[PDB]
């Protein structure tokens, strides 16, 4: 299929309306960053020759 | 096709397999890049039919509808203005998509100011969206309110200005 | 930067080689529709919020925070006087209540 991008929403803009929020939600999401890779060391010599 | 060659290339071992991956990699990042830059909303807004926006024209960089490719003049300009084994991955998303996502951002910023990039798009008029602004840079709002015509003149001049240096430059 | 929303902590928690950010954030909710001004015109003179915005639910006007509806009174204690009310676009009438009114009043 084609992909959608989004639902489509409207905003309803008037040159004299606002919409102001009446209560809230506390929300906690999470957010994974990779910090550090495995230390490797290669002998060369005996990788290459044993 | 000469499989003699194949046969001797076959003694050095998995090169081909890590020279596909490393370029499949870089290809899928590619994908990942533009999804960052521009799937940055999941709500596809759009501005009113009446771009009554107190004075402020956005005309230059809202999506032309005379278009077939429904880009702003100043996306159009910019798309102009930009000129053996070998296969070219066509990018997951389209050049219309990616404009269907500015569109997006822009109808979002204009409509709603910054409360659709926190939540939940809250509709504000536009001079005061600009005054909230004032008030960001430390300036009272009396200032936009009793100078608007005059900004928006200097914004629209300004964007106008965009756009001829933009087909000015090369 | 700090999660989708308007950011309140963040607190971190070790990973097998990263780092795990729990973003608190703060979301609007619930939110509703208000006719609001940029100014009030009250006595000649043009009046702007001094940190709200100024809303009204059909036939009554007050100033309320941007980010949270708290409906207050109009009052000089929480609006600025710039100017009279030819200048502004779409400034609106309504009174502006003093609360030291009442009190050289007694
Ligand atoms: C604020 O009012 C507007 C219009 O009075 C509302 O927008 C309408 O919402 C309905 C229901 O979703 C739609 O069917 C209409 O097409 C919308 N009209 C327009 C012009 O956008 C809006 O939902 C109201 N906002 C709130 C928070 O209630
Ligand atoms: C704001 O939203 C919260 C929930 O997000 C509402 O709290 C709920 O209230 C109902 C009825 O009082 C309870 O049955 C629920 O259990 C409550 N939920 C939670 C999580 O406590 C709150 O009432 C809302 N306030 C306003 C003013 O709309
Ligand atoms: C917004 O800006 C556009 C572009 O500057 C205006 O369109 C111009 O209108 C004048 C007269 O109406 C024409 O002579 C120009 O040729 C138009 N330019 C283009 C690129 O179409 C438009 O009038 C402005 N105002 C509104 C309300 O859209
Ligand atoms: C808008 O809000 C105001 C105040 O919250 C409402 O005015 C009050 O309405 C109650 C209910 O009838 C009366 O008991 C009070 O005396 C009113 N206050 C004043 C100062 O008159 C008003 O009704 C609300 N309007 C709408 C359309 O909801
Ligand atoms: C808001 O109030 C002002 C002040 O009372 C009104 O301005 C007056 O309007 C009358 C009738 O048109 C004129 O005779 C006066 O000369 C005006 N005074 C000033 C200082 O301009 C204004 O019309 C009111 N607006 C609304 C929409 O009610
Ligand atoms: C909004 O537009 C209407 C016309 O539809 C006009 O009468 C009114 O004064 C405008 N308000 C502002 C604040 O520009």
Same mark, same amino acid.
């Given at each position: 299929? +084609?992909? #959608?991008?989004?639902? *489509? ?12 929020? %009446?209560?809230? +939600?506390? #929300?906690?999401?999470? *957010? ?12 060369? %010599? ?5 | ?170 | ?106």
């Amino acid at each position: 299929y +084609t992909m #959608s991008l989004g639902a *489509e929403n409207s905003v309803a803009y008037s040159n004299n309306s606002i919409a102001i929020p %009446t209560n809230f +939600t506390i #929300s906690v999401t999470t *957010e994974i960053l990779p910090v550090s890779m495995t230390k490797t060391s290669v002998d060369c %010599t005996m990788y290459i020759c044993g | 096709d000469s499989t003699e060659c194949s046969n001797l290339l076959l003694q050095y071992g998995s090169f081909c397999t890590q020279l596909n991956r490393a370029l499949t990699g870089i290809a899928v990042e590619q994908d990942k890049n533009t999804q960052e830059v521009f799937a940055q909303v999941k709500q596809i807004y759009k501005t009113p039919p009446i771009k009554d926006f107190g004075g402020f024209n956005f005309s230059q960089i809202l999506p032309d509808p005379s278009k077939p490719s429904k880009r702003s003049p100043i996306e159009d300009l910019l798309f102009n203005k930009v000129t053996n084994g070998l296969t070219v991955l066509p990018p997951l998303l389209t050049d219309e998509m990616i404009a269907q996502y500015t569109s997006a951002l822009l109808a979002g910023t204009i409509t709603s100011g910054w409360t659709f990039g926190a939540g939940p798009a809250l509709q504000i008029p536009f001079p005061m969206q600009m005054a909230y602004r004032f008030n960001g840079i430390g300036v009272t709002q009396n200032v936009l309110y009793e100078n608007q015509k005059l900004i928006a003149n200097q914004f629209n001049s300004a964007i106008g200005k965009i756009q001829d240096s933009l087909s000015s430059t090369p | 930067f700090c999660g989708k929303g308007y950011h309140l902590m963040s607190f971190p928690q070790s990973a097998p080689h990263g780092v795990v950010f729990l973003h608190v954030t703060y979301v609007p909710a619930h939110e509703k529709n208000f006719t609001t001004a940029p100014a009030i015109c009250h006595d000649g003179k043009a009046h702007f919020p001094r940190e709200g915005v100024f809303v009204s639910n059909g036939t009554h006007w007050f100033v309320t925070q941007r980010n949270f509806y708290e409906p207050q009174i109009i009052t000089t204690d929480n609006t600025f006087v710039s100017g009279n009310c030819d200048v502004v676009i779409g400034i609106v009438n309504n009174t502006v209540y003093d609360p030291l009114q009442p009190e050289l009043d007694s």
